[PDB]
Write a protein that binds this ligand. Structure first.
Ligand SMILES: Nc1nc2c(ncn2[C@@H]2O[C@H](COP(=O)(O)OP(=O)(O)CP(=O)(O)O)[C@@H](O)[C@H]2O)c(=O)[nH]1
Ligand SMILES: Nc1nc2c(ncn2[C@@H]2O[C@H](COP(=O)(O)OP(=O)(O)CP(=O)(O)O)[C@@H](O)[C@H]2O)c(=O)[nH]1
Ligand SMILES: Nc1nc2c(ncn2[C@@H]2O[C@H](COP(=O)(O)OP(=O)(O)CP(=O)(O)O)[C@@H](O)[C@H]2O)c(=O)[nH]1
Ligand SMILES: Nc1nc2c(ncn2[C@@H]2O[C@H](COP(=O)(O)OP(=O)(O)CP(=O)(O)O)[C@@H](O)[C@H]2O)c(=O)[nH]1
Ligand SMILES: [Mg+2]
Ligand SMILES: [Mg+2]
Ligand SMILES: [Mg+2]
Ligand SMILES: [Mg+2]
Lengths: 171, 171, 171, 171
């Protein structure tokens, strides 16, 4: 069985824990209850491969920067989240991505760009501009609704396929 | 994630467009304007790989300014299309074929032969005839109906499989 | 074609026979009952590979200290089963696994932990515990019910895969 | 796409041509027209691989036995067929198998045991001694019916799988 180290990264409030929790436990989290760091484990088959998803749920709040360094060392792939109703979240993602590359050096680093809360009728952020970005980045993009569970399994499973490719035809 | 430049080549009225928009907009068009150059991107997974399909819907028809020249050079794979109910559409294939080979300088070129309009009870091109040409070329031939969307995914994923395969070239 | 030698072990009455019969005879046969130890066979295709599964159904009854070493010795992978409503059979898993680690003389030996009787209401062993143990062993955890057939194939086929994967560290 | 060279062998009267023509044309052939040697080509997708199947249909007629050395020299894999209501032909696969080995000078040659005519109630060779012979040989065993089409695609696809596995044995 293969173990994959997924880190859920992103601006505070964007829906990280809720993403993570819909996966792990299949129920939506209303409570906005911050995070320092929380671990989750999940066994799934993806493309007929028995996978152990070891997901690290991180703190998005202005602080906890510094760990924002060693979980980046450790992570094998990042869910970069932001929220379709928040543009600054959209915007700081370039930050998160630059920090990552710097903590690993590597220019090629499994990441997936996730547009959360898409159940919200009120986007200040356009799929297209998200796409344009994932594009210049070289990475997939998926719009999700932790609330409605939609695209949740794809976000995570896609990130596994990214890592997996990255370890094998990543040369 | 792998991005792939695929070009939809052929003759006017074949169905290049219908084909295309069916793959992307997932719906059928007996209405699209007679083309020159129009682009499409599709994010998808094939063979557990996340793929970004960069599709150029080219044109044949009447006049067409300046296209052909260089789209080859950049095209990675070519979908060479013809209609089942048009014998002349079919002879033309050998000619698109031929320019690619010259622009590409090789016979490396990934292509998939497609016989569109699998739905007409008005065939004037025999499968057996198409199969041979394919066989001559040593490339796949898939019959399609943009109308009923029969075989359309196959055509596209087949060509991407070919590119994929081709990339192992002297490694 | 590959031959795969599977050995099912667990405490008496966990459902080892049933489980095997289900995969093989395709029905829940009840009182197959203890002490008769047979090997079954089944050709099947897993992930495009054709496999000959040679399954040994050990008689967990007047168990261990039969010629158990024989089989643990010629086994390539072990299906380690316990019943969901029997804590001791779960407790016993630790003993089977040490025996297997001794006889195979290796810490990494393909095996899958199985919680049989998914079906019974009267659960004594929560899934969390079994999953934490497997996690601790680096092995998959599947819940089955030989009775409703749920989970049965996944259980064995997750095993051939463990086997297949493990094979990869030879050379 | 990949090209695979399949040869169907077996005593006369067994179902070789009716197996090959069902695959290729999807029609049962009621008449018995003895074969010398026919070639067929069928393009298929196996396990996401675009395979061009070059199928050789050979003579069961002992008379044309001189042409075997040749087809055995070039074939990559052998569909070994016998009829479920004719022991002599079950007895004959043996001699076919030994010739292939000699010609090929190898113990591992892709083959598949095919017991055709699954549809006849006058079966005379039980699936168990076929299954047993197969395991001896170390190859798959498929029961087929050219008249009903049952098992025929299993039969050819399984041979493509053997070939591929077998080739893989070096990359
Ligand atoms: N409508 C909607 N609300 C969502 C969705 N995802 C999360 N939320 C809401 O957004 C708020 C933040 O969710 P949470 O998962 O805690 O975000 P977080 O990024 O983990 C925040 P932190 O950095 O502090 O850990 C919660 O009130 C939650 O219910 C979604 O897909 N749809
Ligand atoms: N029945 C049927 N009609 C089709 C199919 N594909 C295309 N057509 C018909 O072909 C006509 C032209 O299709 P279109 O895709 O625009 O042609 P083209 O090859 O794009 C044209 P151009 O080369 O000039 O850009 C339309 O009326 C459409 O209904 C198909 O699979 N089945
Ligand atoms: N409800 C339920 N009962 C089951 C299930 N599997 C087995 N059983 C029950 O367990 C009893 C014992 O099953 P068996 O398969 O013989 O277990 P065993 O491990 O072979 C026992 P032994 O090692 O002694 O031969 C069966 O008689 C049946 O009542 C299951 O998935 N669900
Ligand atoms: N009931 C039944 N009859 C079949 C089946 N396959 C073949 N037959 C019949 O058996 C006869 C021989 O079939 P054929 O395909 O010609 O056999 P062949 O072994 O290719 C003979 P040869 O060596 O001369 O080429 C035909 O009458 C055919 O219709 C089957 O699966 N079921
Ligand atoms: Mg959180
Ligand atoms: Mg067009
Ligand atoms: Mg038993
Ligand atoms: Mg014949």
């Amino acid at each position: 069985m293969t173990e994959y180290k997924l880190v859920v990264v992103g601006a505070g409030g964007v829906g990280k824990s809720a993403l993570t929790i819909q996966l792990i436990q299949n129920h939506f989290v209303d409570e906005y209850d911050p995070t320092i760091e929380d671990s989750y484990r999940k066994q799934v088959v993806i493309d007929g491969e028995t996978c152990l998803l070891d997901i690290l749920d991180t703190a998005g709040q202005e602080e906890y920067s510094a760990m924002r360094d060693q979980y980046m060392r450790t992570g094998e792939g990042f869910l970069c989240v932001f929220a379709i109703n928040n543009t600054k979240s959209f915007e700081d993602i370039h930050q998160y991505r630059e920090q990552i590359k710097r903590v690993k050096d590597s220019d090629d680093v499994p990441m997936v760009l996730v547009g959360n809360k898409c159940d919200l009728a009120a986007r200040t952020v356009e799929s297209r501009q998200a796409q344009d970005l994932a594009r210049s980045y070289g990475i997939p993009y998926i719009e999700t609704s932790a609330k409605t569970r939609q695209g949740v399994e794809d976000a995570f499973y896609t990130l596994v396929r990214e890592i997996r490719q990255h370890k094998l035809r990543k040369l």
